[PDB]
Design a protein around this ligand. Structure first.
Ligand code: NAP
Ligand code: FOL
Length: 160
């Protein structure tokens, strides 16, 4: 099973200069809660943006690099390998970046979208998709506080 998790702004922005466009600590805490217990699948630039493997998850990096360059991870060279690893009932989380979200979109079963109601500047976007193909299963407004000073919400869609 393939689930996506991502945070995007009102213009579908996810990144700028190989980095996040904002700081939203409660959303990162949510990401940790959701992805705990699961293999996480990421592109090489997303791994480097994170900087070190995330704890308590199998970190799978899609890259042409040798395995030796990402020893704290499991390297695969093709998304075919991702589908083989992820086939069946056990849930993989695809954690970006734009290239994986776009190319793996037809194979996603679930979308865990943090929607930030703001427009930032940047250079990487989540792919357009027709929301009419999806059911909104859950929605929760994110805490707006001093550390998390946006209007944001945690949405989960499941494919029809
Ligand atoms: N807001 C969010 O939720 C969120 C989530 C994740 C990432 N981001 C942001 O997104 C940006 C990164 O996204 P991106 O699209 O530039 O990079 P990316 O998808 O993370 O990484 C691209 C690299 O991954 C490898 N790759 C990707 N698809 C491949 C495929 N099918 N087969 C083989 N290799 C493949 C290649 O590595 P090699 O060149 O090594 O072969 C490619 O150069 C950063 O700004 C990051 O902060 C945001
Ligand atoms: N909802 C969501 N928000 C994001 O910002 C996001 N970012 C990525 C890629 N970038 C990152 C950057 C940092 C961490 C990170 O440090 N996560 C820790 C957070 C621990 C905490 O803050 O409590 C982790 O253990 O998951 C994860 C992904 C992928 N999916 C996302 N999904």
């Amino acid at each position: 099973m393939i689930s996506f998790i991502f945070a995007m702004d009102a213009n579908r922005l996810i990144g700028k200069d190989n980095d996040l466009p904002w700081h939203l600590p409660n959303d990162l805490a949510y990401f940790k809660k959701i992805t705990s217990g699961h293999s996480i699948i990421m592109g090489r630039k997303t791994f480097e943006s994170i900087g070190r493997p995330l704890p308590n998850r199998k970190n799978i990096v899609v890259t042409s690099a040798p395995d030796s360059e990402f020893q704290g991870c499991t390297v695969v060279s093709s998304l075919k390998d991702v589908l083989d690893i992820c086939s069946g009932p056990e849930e993989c989380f695809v954690i970006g970046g734009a290239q994986l979200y776009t190319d793996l979109f037809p194979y996603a079963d679930r979308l865990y979208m943090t929607k930030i109601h703001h427009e930032f500047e940047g250079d990487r976007h989540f792919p357009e998709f027709d929301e009419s193909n999806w059911k909104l299963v859950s929605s929760e407004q994110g805490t707006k506080d001093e550390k998390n000073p946006y209007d944001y919400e945690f949405l989960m869609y499941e494919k029809k």
